[PDB]
Amino acid sequence: TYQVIQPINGDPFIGSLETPITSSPLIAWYLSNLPGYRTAVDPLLRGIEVGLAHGYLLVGPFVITGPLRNAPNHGAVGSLGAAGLIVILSITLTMYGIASFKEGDPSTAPSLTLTGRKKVPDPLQTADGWARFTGGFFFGGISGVIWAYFLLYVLDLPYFVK
Amino acid sequence: EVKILVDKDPVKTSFEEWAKPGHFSRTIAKGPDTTTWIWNLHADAHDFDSHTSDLEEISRKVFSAHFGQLSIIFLWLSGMYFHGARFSNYEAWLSDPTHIGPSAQVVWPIVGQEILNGDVGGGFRGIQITSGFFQMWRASGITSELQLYCTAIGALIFAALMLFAGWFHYHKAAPKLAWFQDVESMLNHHLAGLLGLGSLGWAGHQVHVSLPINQFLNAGVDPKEIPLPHEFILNRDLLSQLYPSFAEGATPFFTLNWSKYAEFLTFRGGLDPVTGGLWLTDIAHHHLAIAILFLIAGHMYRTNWGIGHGLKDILEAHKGPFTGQGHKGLYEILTTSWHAQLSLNLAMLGSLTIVVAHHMYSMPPYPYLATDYGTQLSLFTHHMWIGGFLIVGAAAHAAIFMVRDYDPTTRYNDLLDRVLRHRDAIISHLNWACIFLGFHSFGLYIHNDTMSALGRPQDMFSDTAIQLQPVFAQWIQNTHALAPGATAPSATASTSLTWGGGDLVAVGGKVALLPIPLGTADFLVHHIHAFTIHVTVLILLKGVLFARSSRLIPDKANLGFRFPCDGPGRGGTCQVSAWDHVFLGLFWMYNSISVVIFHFSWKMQSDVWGSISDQGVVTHITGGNFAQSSITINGWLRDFLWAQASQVIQSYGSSLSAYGLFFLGAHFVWAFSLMFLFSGRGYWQELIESIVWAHNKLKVAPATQPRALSIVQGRAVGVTHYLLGGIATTWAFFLARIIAVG
Amino acid sequence: YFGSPTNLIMVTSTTLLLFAGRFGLAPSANRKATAGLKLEVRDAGLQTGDPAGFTLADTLACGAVGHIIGVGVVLGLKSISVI
Amino acid sequence: RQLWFASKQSLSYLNGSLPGDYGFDPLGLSDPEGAGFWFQPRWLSYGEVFNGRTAMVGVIGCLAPEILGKAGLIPPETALPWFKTGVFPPAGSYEYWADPYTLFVFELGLVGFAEHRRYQDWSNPGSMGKQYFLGLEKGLGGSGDPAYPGGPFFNPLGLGKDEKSMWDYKVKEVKNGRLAMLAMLGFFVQAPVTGVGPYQNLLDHLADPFNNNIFTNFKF
Amino acid sequence: FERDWLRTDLNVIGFGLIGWLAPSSIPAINGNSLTGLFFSSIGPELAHFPTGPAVTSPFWLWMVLWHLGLFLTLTFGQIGFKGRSEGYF
Amino acid sequence: MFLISWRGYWQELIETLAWAHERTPLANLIRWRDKPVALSIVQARLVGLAHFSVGYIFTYAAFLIASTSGKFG
Ligand code: CLA
Numbered sequence A: 001t002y003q004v005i006q007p008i009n010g011d012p013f014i015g016s017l018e019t020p021i022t023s024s025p026l027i028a029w030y031l032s033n034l035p036g037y038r039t040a041v042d043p044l045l046r047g048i049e050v051g052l053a054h055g056y057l058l059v060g061p062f063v064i065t066g067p068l069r070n071a072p073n074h075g076a077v078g079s080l081g082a083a084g085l086i087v088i089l090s091i092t093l094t095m096y097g098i099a100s101f102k103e104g105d106p107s108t109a110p111s112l113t114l115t116g117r118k119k120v121p122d123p124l125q126t127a128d129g130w131a132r133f134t135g136g137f138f139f140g141g142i143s144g145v146i147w148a149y150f151l152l153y154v155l156d157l158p159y160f161v162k
Numbered sequence B: 001e002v003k004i005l006v007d008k009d010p011v012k013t014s015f016e017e018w019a020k021p022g023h024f025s026r027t028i029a030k031g032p033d034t035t036t037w038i039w040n041l042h043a044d045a046h047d048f049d050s051h052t053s054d055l056e057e058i059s060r061k062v063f064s065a066h067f068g069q070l071s072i073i074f075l076w077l078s079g080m081y082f083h084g085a086r087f088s089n090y091e092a093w094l095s096d097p098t099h100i101g102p103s104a105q106v107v108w109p110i111v112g113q114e115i116l117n118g119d120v121g122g123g124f125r126g127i128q129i130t131s132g133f134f135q136m137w138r139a140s141g142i143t144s145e146l147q148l149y150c151t152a153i154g155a156l157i158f159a160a161l162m163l164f165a166g167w168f169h170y171h172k173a174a175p176k177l178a179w180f181q182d183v184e185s186m187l188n189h190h191l192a193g194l195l196g197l198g199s200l201g202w203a204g205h206q207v208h209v210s211l212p213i214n215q216f217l218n219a220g221v222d223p224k225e226i227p228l229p230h231e232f233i234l235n236r237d238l239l240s241q242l243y244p245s246f247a248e249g250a251t252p253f254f255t256l257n258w259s260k261y262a263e264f265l266t267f268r269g270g271l272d273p274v275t276g277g278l279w280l281t282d283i284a285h286h287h288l289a290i291a292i293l294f295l296i297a298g299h300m301y302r303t304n305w306g307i308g309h310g311l312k313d314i315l316e317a318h319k320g321p322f323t324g325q326g327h328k329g330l331y332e333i334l335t336t337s338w339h340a341q342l343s344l345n346l347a348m349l350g351s352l353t354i355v356v357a358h359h360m361y362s363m364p365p366y367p368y369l370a371t372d373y374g375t376q377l378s379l380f381t382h383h384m385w386i387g388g389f390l391i392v393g394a395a396a397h398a399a400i401f402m403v404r405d406y407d408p409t410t411r412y413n414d415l416l417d418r419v420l421r422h423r424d425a426i427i428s429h430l431n432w433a434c435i436f437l438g439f440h441s442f443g444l445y446i447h448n449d450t451m452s453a454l455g456r457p458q459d460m461f462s463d464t465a466i467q468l469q470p471v472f473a474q475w476i477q478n479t480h481a482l483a484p485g486a487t488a489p490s491a492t493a494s495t496s497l498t499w500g501g502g503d504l505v506a507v508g509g510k511v512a513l514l515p516i517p518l519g520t521a522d523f524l525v526h527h528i529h530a531f532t533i534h535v536t537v538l539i540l541l542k543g544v545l546f547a548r549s550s551r552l553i554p555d556k557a558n559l560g561f562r563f564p565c566d567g568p569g570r571g572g573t574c575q576v577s578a579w580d581h582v583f584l585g586l587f588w589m590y591n592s593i594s595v596v597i598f599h600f601s602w603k604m605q606s607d608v609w610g611s612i613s614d615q616g617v618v619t620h621i622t623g624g625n626f627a628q629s630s631i632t633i634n635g636w637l638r639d640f641l642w643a644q645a646s647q648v649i650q651s652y653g654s655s656l657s658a659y660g661l662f663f664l665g666a667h668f669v670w671a672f673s674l675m676f677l678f679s680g681r682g683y684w685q686e687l688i689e690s691i692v693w694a695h696n697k698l699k700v701a702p703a704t705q706p707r708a709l710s711i712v713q714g715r716a717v718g719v720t721h722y723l724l725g726g727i728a729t730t731w732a733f734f735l736a737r738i739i740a741v742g
Numbered sequence C: 001y002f003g004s005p006t007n008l009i010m011v012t013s014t015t016l017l018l019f020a021g022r023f024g025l026a027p028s029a030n031r032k033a034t035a036g037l038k039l040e041v042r043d044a045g046l047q048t049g050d051p052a053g054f055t056l057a058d059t060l061a062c063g064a065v066g067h068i069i070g071v072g073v074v075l076g077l078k079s080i081s082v083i
Numbered sequence D: 001r002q003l004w005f006a007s008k009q010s011l012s013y014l015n016g017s018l019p020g021d022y023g024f025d026p027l028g029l030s031d032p033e034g035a036g037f038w039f040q041p042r043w044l045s046y047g048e049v050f051n052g053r054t055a056m057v058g059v060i061g062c063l064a065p066e067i068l069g070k071a072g073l074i075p076p077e078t079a080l081p082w083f084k085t086g087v088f089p090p091a092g093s094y095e096y097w098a099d100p101y102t103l104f105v106f107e108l109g110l111v112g113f114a115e116h117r118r119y120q121d122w123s124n125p126g127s128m129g130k131q132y133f134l135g136l137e138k139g140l141g142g143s144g145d146p147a148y149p150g151g152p153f154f155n156p157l158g159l160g161k162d163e164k165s166m167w168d169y170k171v172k173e174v175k176n177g178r179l180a181m182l183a184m185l186g187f188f189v190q191a192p193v194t195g196v197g198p199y200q201n202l203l204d205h206l207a208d209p210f211n212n213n214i215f216t217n218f219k220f
Numbered sequence E: 001f002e003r004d005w006l007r008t009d010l011n012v013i014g015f016g017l018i019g020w021l022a023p024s025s026i027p028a029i030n031g032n033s034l035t036g037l038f039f040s041s042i043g044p045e046l047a048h049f050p051t052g053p054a055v056t057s058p059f060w061l062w063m064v065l066w067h068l069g070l071f072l073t074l075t076f077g078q079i080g081f082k083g084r085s086e087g088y089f
Numbered sequence F: 001m002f003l004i005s006w007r008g009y010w011q012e013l014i015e016t017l018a019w020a021h022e023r024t025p026l027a028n029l030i031r032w033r034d035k036p037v038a039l040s041i042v043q044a045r046l047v048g049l050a051h052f053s054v055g056y057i058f059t060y061a062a063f064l065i066a067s068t069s070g071k072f073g
């Protein structure tokens, strides 16, 4: 008949399976267009995008659920907490990069596509690439926290939940 | 063709194998060399598929064992009816069920134990019973002690019948394997014959013996002047006065005028205000409809004539793009493996028992059961425990089937194969779900405890603080409360008083049931329940799925289903068998059921049960303290464990003194289990080596060499004692509290 | 009672369903339906004396399920108050 | 041979060798494969013949007092429906020389002495013409066929000397046994439905047939 | 992995939508219909935007009973269309 | 937990988590440097004993100090 689930890349002895969750064209395109999988571009810009998303998303919970949520100063306090969390995350990223990558070693990323075509391995899995990524992450996260604060409590836009 | 197939005189009846212990197995029959033998005899007593490889021989054994079990159950029922007839205050309780506590056990006057015969009322001294037999007997129409004696005699006769049937069907007429594998005939007979005809007969009894006698009882006439049940069959005139429709006979039934029977066949809902239970006219109609439904259901499968279904035909036609061949091959598995059928039936029965427990408290079927709090709590807890144990046994026997009877070369099934090909994804996802639920359920309690301890009540998760409202359950309650008007127009009231219809039923100055409110605390306990259920499911499913092999042990099937380990290699391989997984999952089942019964007890004592005065004011047992106190662990420790244990700890010198003694004994046994759970047999064998020297010095060393318990046996002893002590602690505490204050 | 609409409904349902079983318009002992309906010829081995192979089991089953249909129609035609 | 609702399974073992054979066995109770104790082909034919023999006498036992008392033959108080003679005390009882429970023990002893001896013939063919039984054992040796003993007592007139008459008589006996079986089942069903005896039921039906039947009696 | 695992037809969507909307619109509920009731309940909830429907609103039950049927018809139509051409029935 | 449950159950469970991490997008970019394994047989006994002793000491210290300080004898 017609079966949907197939072995990964046609190899039945690799510990994975091809399912609509993992191999559908829409999800494949979406994952390929995320900054974490853009192999052929400077990791600094990708880290900028990642930090801009994450620091922006982190503002809400700190501002609204925090201890000073009912104070008139709740927005600034929550934004400061989100910035501190971004700083801690950047520290963790730097620690991982220092522990994982030596300066002279080449990339640990795969050099083959699913079709067996040779490609340039991702420079994100090198010391310099990871350093650029975490610097971009810090710069983007601080900017995203500041932008969320500016949109919520400097222009005071009529957001339903603030 | 479906026909009776038997073998004559397969096994000779003799006492020769009684004198040879361990005759059933090759290894044990040779006699003991060490003490381990003595245990091995009892662990392998009922492992029939290990005694012989013949499917027919095994099937005959289980068929006779079922008859033995039925005989034991009939003996137990006969004893219950005899004690009701001979050592009970049932006849006094009938005339005053609101002020007299049921009692059917009286102790002898020895060593001062006669203090347990307490004042249960009605000029009677005894032990108060919580089985609910009195209310069932009243519902059945039983009025005198003589009818209980006859029931005891009949149950004794039936027990003798089942014992003789077991002997006859193992030793004289043993059915063949083809007879057992006639699954279509068995399903047809169990659906139409057993269930349908049984419910039809019970409906007949209810419309002929139960309805009139209970109408007389609820009218306030003396039990000793109610006409006897047969008098309602002899002169139909007596039956044409309570219900004039009986004057028409069976003509309305055959002419399809069924509304003429609306007097005793109703669709009411709610509870009987005089009784506090479901209307008997509702129950009779329920059983009459169930009889027709099951009689029609029992005609689905093909046995000997063309009409009907083939189970294999239905199974082989259900397949899709995601499941390959589908259910093809399942008929062969379920007709050749006793363990798979046992697993499925155990899971279904354990799930059904929990549903029974949930439905019996919200819709009390028996008269004067709702206002007897001790009976309600006991029945709920008992059925919850039974369901949990059966559910765990389901996983155990599924693992046994996987270890022994699984064979892809001869009994392949696509669904089971595909499940085994992605077990890592299933187990990892269940692991993540368990961690997420544990955090977002229990850590909220820790957050509340820390906020309360820090002097910040406004930062907690509570109804006067950050709210977590169960809006979906509230919507379901509101929908069920509006059913009689829009979605069940023929029904007069909702199926339960707890949905929210804004009414309360009071019997004898006591609250039967009322709308149960749901808030933040309920939101917390429900997710706590879900977390524990998910963890138990994870433990059992991981054992079932990884029983044959794993990345650590590629050949785990050759080690058997019940083995201790595979050595200290690979870092340590302790408790890798499927048996250990059941051993671990028993603890989590115990934890989950304990939390469920604690939730039930506190909620019922705080928001439902209580007293009502002749002013219209309700006062609950603990005064609605669940909403604000059950949101912290300290609340459970203080307002539930500490506050409600004050009964069992001050029961000395009263009729409830046996519950404090059992309280202490259960604590002792629970502590005793930790010796077995925390240690290992290597220390104990070495310790025994020194005692054996002392015995040899005095020439008193036994020939049966003393051995420390096996690695698996120690785990079994530890878990058995743990469960016994834990369950008995709650048994004693609950019974003392609900008898003293209820 | 004879000639009443309920009696008429019971008799017409029983006769229609007996006719449908008899004339190969419904599953019977000698006619089993595949997954997509599609009755197939089956040798039940019953023997009936009827030229079209209509067995006693077929008559009993058709009568019972026609009675079911008739009761369903009657109870519902008068609940709506058409009868 | 005329067949009534036969089957492939039925015709495999029903070959006309037994009297009153019409191939009627829808449930396959007489299948010789895997058959024993109560459900065996040789016990079932004996059970049918024996039950028909008791039913044939029982129909007359039920019908004789009521018919005789409807005439001027027997005293009215001894003319009762079969269920008002004391067999069913809720429906009434008669006062005899002995208590009904004492009569039950007497019947138990006599009928037990008869039936155990009958059974030992089935379980051991020639067994009961051997041990001393006050000289009656000379005529209690059986014939090898449990349902047809014969002899000086059970077949004293010596009918059916040839095979062709014995077979015809066996057919008639099994047929009358079936008919009386159905008649007694009708008696048992009619007794609760219509409160009167079978003969009253018969008379009340040939007086106004269209108002005395099951359709009318769906009221009791 | 096949590019289109659904084997999209675009006739199944229309056929299922029409085969749910035609029978559900029969006025057998006190002169009204399931689609009629759901559609008439949509508007009043929109009248008080942006606040959501109340717990005691008739919108939820109608919404759930309509979509259960719609999903059932769509799924059954897809299964029938795909399985009739692969010898499933 | 450490005193009752033993190692093999936890090792077989950690294997599944390793697979799940190795198959999760945006998490394959992060790799462990030490292979995750369950606690050793002797290590688990020590850990469980430490937890047992710490709870035993803290519970009684809290109870004793609070009970003697609520009323001061
Ligand atoms: C599950 C069923 C069940 C249970 C739990 C009970 C439980 C009980 N019944 Mg009971 N009973 C039952 C079924 C049951 N019964 C049935 C079916 C009947 C009908 C026949 C009865 C009829 C019945 C009567 C008539 C009485 C009880 C009594 C009792 C109570 C005391 C029993 C006792 O001391 O035993 C007595 C002790 C023994 C039977 C000895 C045990 C024998 C074992 C095999 C060991 C043998 C060793 C021997 C004693 C040593 C000497 C041997 C010799 C060679 C030296 C006890 C609560 C009594 C009671 O409540 O008094 C107020 C009482 O009078 N029961």
Ligand code: CLA
Pocket (backbone or CB within 6 Å): B062, B063, B066, B067, B070, B179, B180, B182, B183, B185, B186, B189, B190, B192, B193, B194
């Ligand atoms: C209408 C017919 C009928 C009925 C009523 C039953 C009833 C039962 N069967 Mg059963 N069975 C049937 C047909 C029937 N079977 C057929 C046709 C087959 C072959 C396909 C089987 C094969 C079968 C197996 C293999 C097993 C059962 C078992 C059981 C028992 C399940 C336990 C229970 O629910 O306790 C309910 C208890 C009661 C209702 C108490 C009353 C006991 C009843 C009245 C006795 C049943 C008599 C029986 C139908 C015929 C007797 C033969 C006759 C010569 C005396 C239950 C008594 C199980 C069991 O426990 O075995 C002992 C079991 O393992 N049955």
Ligand code: CLA
Pocket (backbone or CB within 6 Å): B042, B043, B044, B045, B046, B047, B048, B342, B389, B390, B391, B392, B393, B394, B396, B400, B562, B579, B582, B720
């Ligand atoms: C109808 C249900 C049912 C049936 C037929 C079986 C049948 C079987 N099970 Mg099983 N099981 C069940 C339910 C059932 N179980 C449930 C509910 C659980 C979960 C707890 C289990 C868990 C389980 C495990 C873990 C194992 C089995 C095994 C077995 C097989 C061997 C049984 C044996 O020899 O025991 C012999 C009987 C004993 C040794 C008696 C034990 C006594 C218990 C522990 C005491 C109970 C406490 C008592 C209630 C309180 C008394 C107080 C005291 C002071 C007197 C056998 C096929 C074993 C096997 O190898 O299968 C092939 C096995 O390893 N089962």
Ligand code: CLA
Pocket (backbone or CB within 6 Å): B431, B432, B434, B435, B436, B437, B438, B439, B442, B443, B446, B535, B538, B539, B584, B587, B588, F001, F002, F004, F005
């Ligand atoms: C009270 C004692 C206790 C606790 C807390 C746990 C906790 C756990 N057991 Mg468990 N277990 C115990 C006793 C206990 N067990 C015993 C006695 C046995 C023997 C029968 C077992 C047998 C057992 C098995 C067989 C299994 C578990 C599993 C689990 C995990 C379930 C997932 C979960 O809820 O994660 C959430 C974590 C918690 C609820 C722990 C509390 C965390 C709270 C929120 C505080 C955290 C605050 C913060 C992190 C502190 C940081 C401060 C910083 C300074 C460090 C979890 C780690 C299962 C598992 O691993 O599945 C994933 C599993 O399969 N256990």
Ligand SMILES: CC1=C(/C=C/C(C)=C/C=C/C(C)=C/C=C/C=C(C)/C=C/C=C(C)/C=C/C2=C(C)CCCC2(C)C)C(C)(C)CCC1
Pocket (backbone or CB within 6 Å): B292, C014, C018, C059, C060, C063, C064, C067, C068, C071
């Ligand atoms: C044509 C012809 C003929 C005729 C035939 C016929 C017409 C037959 C019929 C037959 C019939 C006509 C049969 C019937 C049957 C019926 C039945 C068998 C029924 C049953 C019923 C029931 C079982 C019921 C049930 C129920 C109840 C009880 C309750 C309610 C519901 C229900 C419905 C479920 C002859 C052969 C003569 C000759 C040739 C020609």
